[PDB]
Specification:
This is part of a larger assembly, with one copy of chain A, one copy of chain B, three copies of chain C, one copy of chain F, one copy of chain G and three copies of chain H.
Chain A lengths: L2 H46 L12 E6 L9 H15 L3 E6 L1 H11 L3 E6 L8 H12 L7 E9 L5 E7 L20 H74 L1
Parallel strand pairs in A: 1-2, 1-4, 2-3
Antiparallel strand pairs in A: 4-5
Chain B lengths: L6 H4 L3 H28 L2
Chain G lengths: L10 H13 L8 H4 L7 E3 L2
Protein name (chain A): ATP synthase F(1) complex subunit gamma, mitochondrial
Subcellular location (chain A): Mitochondrion inner membrane
GO molecular function (chain A): proton-transporting ATP synthase activity, rotational mechanism
Chain lengths: ~260, ~45, ~110, ~130, ~120, ~130, ~45, ~160, ~160, ~160
Amino acid sequence: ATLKDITRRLKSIKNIQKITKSMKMVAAAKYARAERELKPARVYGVGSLALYEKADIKTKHLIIGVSSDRGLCGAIHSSVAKQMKSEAANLKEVKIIGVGDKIRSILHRTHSDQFLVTFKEVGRRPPTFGDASVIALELLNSGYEFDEGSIIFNRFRSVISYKTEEKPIFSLDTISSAESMSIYDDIDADVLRNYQEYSLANIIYYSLKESTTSEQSARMTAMDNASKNASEMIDKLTLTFNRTRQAVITKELIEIISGAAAL
Amino acid sequence: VRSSAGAVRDAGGAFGKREQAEEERYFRARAKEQLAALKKHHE
Amino acid sequence: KQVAGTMKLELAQYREVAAFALDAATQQLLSRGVRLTELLKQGQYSPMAIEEQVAVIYAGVRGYLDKLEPSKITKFENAFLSHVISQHQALLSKIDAKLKEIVTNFLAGFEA
Amino acid sequence: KQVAGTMKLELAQYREVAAFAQFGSDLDAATQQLLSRGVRLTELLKQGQYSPMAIEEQVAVIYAGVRGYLDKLEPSKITKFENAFLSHVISQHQALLSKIRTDGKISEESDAKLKEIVTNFLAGFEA
Amino acid sequence: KQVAGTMKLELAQYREVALDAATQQLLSRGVRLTELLKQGQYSPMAIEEQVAVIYAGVRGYLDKLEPSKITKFENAFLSHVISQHQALLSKIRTDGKISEESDAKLKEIVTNFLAGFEA
Amino acid sequence: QMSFTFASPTQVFFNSANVRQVDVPTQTGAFGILAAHVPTLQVLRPGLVVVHAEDGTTSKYFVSSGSVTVNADSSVQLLAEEAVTLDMLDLGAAKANLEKAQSELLGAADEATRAEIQIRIEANEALVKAL
Amino acid sequence: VAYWRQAGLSYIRYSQICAKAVRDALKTEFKANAMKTSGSTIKIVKV
Amino acid sequence: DPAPATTFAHLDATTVLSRAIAELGIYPAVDPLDSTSRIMDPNIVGSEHYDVARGVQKILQDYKSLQDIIAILGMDELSEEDKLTVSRARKIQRFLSQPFQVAEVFTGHLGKLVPLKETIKGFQQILAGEYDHLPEQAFYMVGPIEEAVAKADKLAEEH
Amino acid sequence: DPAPATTFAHLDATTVLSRAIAELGIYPAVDPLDSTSRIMDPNIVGSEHYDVARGVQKILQDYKSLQDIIAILGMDELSEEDKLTVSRARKIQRFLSQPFQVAEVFTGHLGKLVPLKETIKGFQQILAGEYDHLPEQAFYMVGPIEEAVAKADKLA
Amino acid sequence: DPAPATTFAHLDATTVLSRAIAELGIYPAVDPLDSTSRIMDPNIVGSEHYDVARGVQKILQDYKSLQDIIAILGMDELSEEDKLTVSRARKIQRFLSQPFQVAEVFTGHLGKLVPLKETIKGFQQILAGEYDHLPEQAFYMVGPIEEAVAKADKLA
C-alpha cells in the first residue's frame, strides 16, 4: 500500500478502537444495572412460573422470540432464531411473534407468512412491565386465538454465558380447565380471565429482563473483542507506517542526489 | 489527542462503505414513510 | 439512450446500498441492481450490436429477472440472446409500442 | 495562576471522558460531574476575533466557571452569561477589577467580594 | 526423526490458530510441546537425553498435565533418567535409534514417574 | 408453615418465607390466607396486604394490582405490579391526585376514557384511605 | 364484567393505571425511581 | 503537493472541490469544510449571513464525528437528537448542490441561479427544523427552497 | 519492484507464491488470486474446467472481502449464507494445497500427483456443497478428493 | 529510526520516565515495567537480587491485569487471593517512590539515599506479607523500611 493509504487506514482503525472501547464501557455499566434489576425480577418471574411447575398441563401454536434490535452482541439473535425455526418445523399450525427487529431480519425469507406482529425499540432503555404490557395488549386484542404458545429467550447465567430457553404459555383460557387444574375449581370465568392476562404479562416481562441482561453482557464481550482486534491491527499497521515513512524519505533523497550528480 | 473525525469514511474502507450503505438504507425507509404521510396530507 | 438511461439511474441508486452484499428490507433495495450487474458481464471476442445490447438490458431494466437466481442470469442472457438473434431478427429492426409487447412475449415463455 | 490551575485539571479530566458525553447514558454521577464542568469551561475558551481581554476580566469569567456558578446553567447560555456577567462587572465593579489588577492576586477579601457579585448576578440572570 | 518427525508438524499448525473439536486439541498439544522445547542457557543436552524428553511429550503423556508444570517435570525427569537409566540413554545413543526394547523401557519409565510427587 | 413469596417486578418483600397468615385485597372481596388453604387463583385491587409473622404480630404493604396463587403444597405467591411500604408514599400527593381525577370524572365524554378515570379515583381512594 | 371490562379494557390496562397511581403518590425521595421503571420504549411494527 | 499548497497564500477566496463529494453525486463538488473567504466575517457579510454559514459548518462537522460512530453502531441505535443532526446535515449537503446552466448538457435539467438572501433563508430554515418532514431527496439539485417544497410534492404524487 | 514488475509481460502463465499463504502452512504457497494463464479460456480448457476455476476464484475473493469485517467484528456479525462462504472458502484454500514428491524431506508425507479430471471434479463438488459436512483440516495436504473423505474418518 | 536504533546497540540499561507514573503521584517517575537492565542476571547481581526484582516485577504485572477487571466489572468480582496481591502491589509501588536530597528546597521534605541491601530486604518483606497489617501511606515517599514502620506510628 501507499503511504497515504496506510495513514488513512491507521486513522480509521484508531477511531474504531476508541469507539468500541467506549461502547464496551457503556455496555459494562448497562450490564451491571441489568444484573441488579434481574435479581428481584427473577424472584417475581419464577413465582409466576410456580403454577405450571406444580401441575401436569397438556392441551394453533404461538412462538414468541425475544432478543433486541441491536447488533454486536455475539450469537444472541442467531441462537433464539435457531430455536424458533427448529421448534416451528417440529410443530401443528404455527404463528410467530418477534420482539426485537433482529428476529424478523433472520426469519423473514422463510417464515414471512407465519409472522403475526413484530416489536421494535428493544435494547435502548431497560425493559419495564409497561413493555411487557404493550406486547401483551397487542396479542390479546389483535385477532389471533392460540391454543398453545411458547416464548423463546436467552436466560442469563454469567458475564460470558447464557442459555436459550423455552417457556410455555397455556394462556388458552379453555385449557385452564383440564386434568390437573381440577383442584382450582370455584373460580368464575371473569377472574380466571384476569389471572390469565396478568400471567401472560408476567412471563413476557420475565423473558424481557433475562434477555436484556444476556444481551448487555454479550455486547460488552463483543465490543471488548472488537477493540482488542483493532489494537492488534493498529500495532501492525503502525510498524508498516514507520517502515514506509522512512523508505519514502530515503527514496526521495536518492532521487535528488541522482539529479544533482547528473548535472 | 490529534483531531480525527470522519476518518472512517475518509479511508474508503469496508467499514467506510458499510456505513454509507447503512445511512442510505435508513433514509430510504424514512423517505417512504414521509412521502406516504405527504400523500395523506394531500387530502 | 432510453434503456441505459434508466440503468444508469438504477445502478447509481444500487451502488449507494451495494455494500450490504443478515438483511431485512435492504433486499428490495438490492434486487434490480444485482440483476443489472450480472447483465453487464460479457464474454470475449463477441462484441454486440447496439440493438442486441438494448434487448438484453431491457429484460433486466423492465424487471423481468427480479425473481430469477442472480447466478443464472449469465446462462439466461446467452440463451435468450441466441434465440432472439436466430428467430427474432425482425424485432431487431429500425434499430417501443409493438416492441414493448413483443419482448415480454418471449421473455415470459422463455423464463420457464 | 489561581483559577487556571484548577481549569487545567478539570479540562484534562473532561478530555478523558469527552467521548462518553456524545454516547453514554447509564454512567455514574461522578463522570457526569466531569462532563458538565468540561462542556461549560470549554465554552469559556471561545473568543471572537479582535477583542483581547484584560487579565482581570479573564480571571473573573474563569472564576465563575471554576467555582461552579455555571454548573446549573445550559451550555448554550454560557457565552450569553459570560458577556452579560462581564458587562455587569465592568459597568459597576471597577474597584474590584482594579485591585485584582494592581495586586496581581485574589486576596481573601477579593474572593469574598467576587463570590457575592457572581451569586447576585446569576440569581437574576434570565430576564 | 522418530519423535521430531511429528513434533515439527504439530507446531506450524498450532501457530496459525493463535467446547470445540480437533481444532482445540491442536492448541492443547501445541502449548505442551512449546513448554517442552524451553531450555535454560548453558544447559547442553546430548541427543539421547533430548529424544527421551521429546518422547514424553510427543507420545501424549503430558497431555493430561497442566502447562505450568511441564518445566518442573522435565528437570526432575531428565535428572532421574540421568541418574539410574544411563543404560537406556546409552542404548539410544549407540544404536542411533529407539529400538523396541528401548521403546518399551521408556514407556514404563514415564508412566511410573508421572505419578508420584508432591503438589 | 406456608412458604410465602411476595414481590413486585422491581422489589422482593418475602422469598419462600414462613408466615402464619396473609390478608389480601381481592377483586371480589378480601382473602385471608392460612397454611392449610385450598388451592385458588385470584387477582387484586388497590389496598393493603397484612402479613402475620411466625413470631408475634404483623407488617403492612400497599399493593396496586396483580395476582395471588395458593397451591396444593403450602406455597403462596403474591405478585403485585406495584408494592410499597406506606413509609414511601406522600399523603399530600395522593389527596391532590384524588381531586385531579375527581375533576376528570365530571368531564370525560368517552366510555373507555371514563373507566380509566374511575380506576384512578379508586386507586387514590385506597391510597388516601391507607395514609 | 366489571365497569372497566364492559368498556373493553383488560386487567393488564386496569393494573397499569393502578400501578401508575401508586407511583404518582410517592414523595421526592422514592420518586427518583419512577424514571428507571414505568417506561414506554417498545413500539409496534406495522407495514 | 507543493504546487497547489504554495498557491493558497495567493488567494482571497478558495473553492476546494472534493472527489468524495463528487462521487456522492453532489455538484458542484465543493468541500464546505475546506473552502474559505477573507470576507467571511460578520462585520462584512453581516451577522445573519455569518451565523447561518457557521451553523451549517458546525452541523456538517458534527456529522463527521457521528459517521464514525454509525460505522460500528448503525443508524437505528443513535439517540433521537443524533438522528436529527444526521437528518438535517444530510438535507444541508444536498441543498448545497445546484443545477448549473452550463451542465444542462449532462443531465437535461435547467440551470438555476439563487439570490444571496434566498440562499441564507433556505439554510436558516433547514437548520431551524422547518423541513424535518420532507425527504432529503427533495433538496437534491434544486434552486431556491421553494423548489424543494415543490419537488417533495411531485414525489408524493409519484408514490 | 522494477525487476519482477518488468518480468510479467514476458510470460504466458504466471504462478505467484505468497509468504502469507505459506504461513497458513499451505504448500505450494500459490496465490490463487494472483496467478494467471493465457489458456484459461473456455474455448481451450472447456467450459467445465473454466466454470469451476472461476467459481473457486469468486468464492476466494468474496471471502477476502469479508476479512476486514471479520478481522474486527468476528464471525457473529455474518449471516448464515456468509458463514457458508467462509466455510466453503477455507476448505477450498486447504484443498489447493498438495504434498510434493520432492518435499518429503520436510513434510513427512508421501508426494501426490493429481489428474486434471480429478482436480476439476474435486473442486466442483466442494463448490456444490457436497462436502459441507467434513472438517476443514481433512482437506489439508492431500491428493484427490477421496483422500479428504478418508482423512476425515481418521478422526472422531 | 536509524538514530535510536544505532544508540540502542551501545546501551546496557534503560531508565524510562513517564507522565502516567508522575500523575499517580510517584517520584521518581520511573516506569517499573518498561525500564530494563542487561545486568539483571543471577550471576551478576546475586540470587537474592534477581528473585526479589523478578518477584516485584510479577506482582505489578498481576496488579495490571487485576485492575482491568475492576474497571469493567467490580472490586468484589475477584477472589480471596486477588485482593491480597492488590494490597501488596499498591505498597510496592509506594515503596518504589523516594524523596530526593536535591528536591528538598521545594517540597519541604528531607531526601533519602538508600543502600542496595536495604532496598532488597525492604521489598522482599512486602512480598512475604510481613507488612499486610500496615496502611499504604506509610510506605509512600520514604527511605529504608525502618521509616515505613515508623511513619505508621506517627500517623493518626
